[PDB]
């Protein structure tokens, strides 16, 4: 289909809360090989985040039941939970692999501006992080190395090109700190990054308009909330 029709249908799917359809429409739009506007970038992200978010939530529920049943839940367990967790896991890996394919085949290379590049490299780190949440063995190590490398490149660019209160820069740092804490088991690095990010942004909040402040502090509050949990 023409790109404009795919975008129109993505926007309709969004209004209809049809996020699988929305993601498929945006995938087709991306595959035309032209850059995305900020609006379109957000359509892509919203769609796939909703899809993978439901799969992640399902995986966590199932994995938890599976562990509490491998904790002496003996005779209260056939293979059903494991089989269903594996099913949801394979489906989640597929969606993450699809997004990463779009990022590596089109979006990162074709991005003509630093803000877009940071946005997509952050997405690359995020979807590798979701893969890492379910990975085992050699897959897990590869995935964790790839997440770190994407997040780090995004961080370098954002420190060069974006002010410390920029919401994209803040959300990147937030998600990289979650990667440190939950994925890499580097809680020193996580707490350090979250606190430094908060402090360097605080320092600028007095120059911000009402609207800028709302965007920035939304993210800063989450940094604060994580520091609570992590300390």
């Amino acid at each position: 289909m023409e790109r404009a029709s795919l975008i129109q249908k993505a926007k309709l799917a969004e209004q209809a809360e049809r996020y699988e359809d929305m993601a498929a429409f945006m995938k087709g739009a991306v595959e035309k090989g032209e850059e995305l506007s900020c609006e379109e970038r957000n359509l892509l992200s919203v769609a796939y985040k909703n899809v993978v978010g439901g799969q992640r939530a399902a995986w966590r529920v199932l994995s938890s039941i599976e562990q509490k049943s491998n904790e002496e839940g003996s005779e209260e367990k056939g293979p059903e939970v494991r089989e269903y967790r594996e099913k949801v896991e394979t489906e989640l890996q597929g969606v993450c692999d699809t997004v990463l394919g779009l990022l590596d085949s089109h979006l990162i290379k074709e991005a003509g501006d630093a803000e877009s590049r940071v946005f997509y490299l952050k997405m690359k780190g995020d979807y590798y992080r979701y893969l890492a949440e379910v990975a085992t063995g050699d897959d897990k190590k590869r995935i964790i190395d790839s997440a770190r490398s994407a997040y780090q490149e995004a961080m370098d660019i954002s420190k060069k090109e974006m002010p410390p209160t920029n919401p994209i820069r803040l959300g990147l740092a937030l998600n990289f700190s979650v990667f440190h804490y939950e994925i890499a088991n580097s809680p020193e690095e996580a707490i350090s990054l979250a606190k430094t990010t908060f402090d360097e942004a605080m320092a600028d909040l007095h120059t911000l308009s009402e609207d800028s402040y709302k965007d920035s502090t939304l993210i800063m509050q989450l940094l604060r909330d994580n520091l609570t949990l992590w300390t």
């Binding site: 919203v46 985040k49 909703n50 952050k122 803040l170 959300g171 990147l172 989450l222 909330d225 992590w230």
Partner: peptide, 8 residues
């Protein structure tokens, strides 16, 4: 379950 960047 830490908090990550919200999606809007």
């Amino acid at each position: 379950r830490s908090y990550s960047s919200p999606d809007i």
